[PDB]
Design a protein around this ligand. Sequence first.
Ligand code: NA
Lengths: 125, 126
Amino acid sequence: AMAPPTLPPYFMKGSIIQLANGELKKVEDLKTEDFIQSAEISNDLKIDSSTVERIEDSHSPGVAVIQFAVGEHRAQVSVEVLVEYPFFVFGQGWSSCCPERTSQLFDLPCSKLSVGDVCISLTLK
Amino acid sequence: GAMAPPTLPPYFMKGSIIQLANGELKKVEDLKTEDFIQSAEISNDLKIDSSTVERIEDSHSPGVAVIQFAVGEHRAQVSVEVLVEYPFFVFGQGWSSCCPERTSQLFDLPCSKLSVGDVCISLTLK
Ligand code: NA
């Protein structure tokens, strides 16, 4: 199970995120709550949360194999992702497997993605 | 099917403003191919990685497309299942997806039909 080979451009710090209420916030100052109400005021989106179960090296160098427990019912999904890929962890902010690279790439301060981290995202319905 | 975070579209970049390496600021919808190359010349540790669309189909799951990529210089084979509205930025083309119409109403921006041979770019390390 592979991840898209592209990264969204809004990760380069200094980028401004528009919340569904109208207020603006720099990508690095983004707080957990900013995800919640944004999805609570959107009749298109809701919040989906996935828990990190395991992090393994992949046969491809610089790429990690993360096993996730997705949403309620904890569906198990393993996905190969770049080590630098930034996840927003519940109550911890931006996290990746290699914050050092995420700093070299986006100048974005990251925590160390760890087992049990609840990575939240905006999804549909 | 069930999708991990990275597989999901970055809906959060709707109406966003990107901070380029050159210090410039651009609304996401106004990004140009040159903006990528121009901000990749700033550092030497940075470069524009390329993934070429080799094949596009429909998955066993509805609303999900099966895209085949040649990733990077060594053209690694990569098959990805994503929601049909997943925005990719294409060399000389800009935002594109398997369902441009759906991408426009969800990310608020013009979107072209993703087609075999499109080179999807992004900023990468090393
Ligand atoms: Na460079």
